């Protein structure tokens, strides 16, 4: 389907990201489907939470507040949802289609304070470029 | 870097396309850069025409009239531009960013009448999906 092509691109994006940035230990795309965030492409270890309940995790923070979450110390954050026993920094970037958030790029790192404003910038731009592709999995 | 990533995506698209559809003998992305069509990603034989003077070829036809071109018999089309000695069908699908054409997907096939309305349908969807990415290589005048 178109979905498969989109998935194809989303996987490739995850790959390119994981490769060019070694601090990225996990790179995944979550999409809003029926009010829940479901994983639809990723590169790294298999996640404990392939589907996320809205509210749980920094994954939910980013789309509910429609803004970047760049947590440099996940342990000191009550809304952190551990998908990996080793990550210390998590960055979540909303992917927007026609203004409205439809999903997100989720990236975990074992390094503390992994993500700089440059990461934030690039990821936001990538989120925008990837938006139509992400949208193929969107459901309200 | 964004361009590098963008090329990554475009190349990947060419690949998936080339794989899923065996009749696609060549798959490429030309982007308008300073009023010219420049090749920025492809899968297949290397083409002698990495840059196209606007006017030449079905490549130019598609962006100038801003519509899909699906030529099932290239030899009967005076606007055809041969980049490969064996191609019989060429389909050119415009890549539109905010309505305005910024580049195109170009696909050659050695098979005659290679491309169907399904091909036309899907490719258009994809050109749209790819439009922001392609746009990273767009340059105006």
UniProtKB/TrEMBL annotation, chain B:
Pfam families: GAF_2. InterPro entries: GAF, GAF-like_dom_sf. Residues 10-132 form the GAF domain. This is GAF domain-containing protein. It comes from Thermoplasma acidophilum (strain ATCC 25905 / DSM 1728 / JCM 9062 / NBRC 15155 / AMRC-C165).
């Amino acid at each position: 389907d178109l979905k498969e092509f989109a998935r194809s691109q989303m996987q490739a994006a995850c790959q390119y990201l994981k490769e060019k940035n070694p601090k990225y230990d996990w790179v995944g795309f979550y999409v809003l489907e029926h009010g829940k965030l479901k994983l639809e492409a990723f590169v790294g270890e298999k996640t404990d939470h392939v589907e996320i309940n809205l509210g749980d995790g920094l994954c939910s923070l980013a789309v509910l507040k429609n803004d970047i979450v760049n947590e440099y110390d996940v342990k000191s954050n009550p809304k952190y949802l551990a998908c990996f026993p080793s990550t210390q920094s998590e960055i979540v970037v909303p992917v927007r289609y026609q203004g409205e958030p439809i999903g997100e790029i989720d990236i975990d790192s074992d390094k503390k304070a992994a993500f700089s404003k440059e990461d934030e910038a690039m990821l936001s731009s990538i989120a925008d470029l990837m938006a139509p592709l992400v949208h193929e999995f969107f459901v309200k």
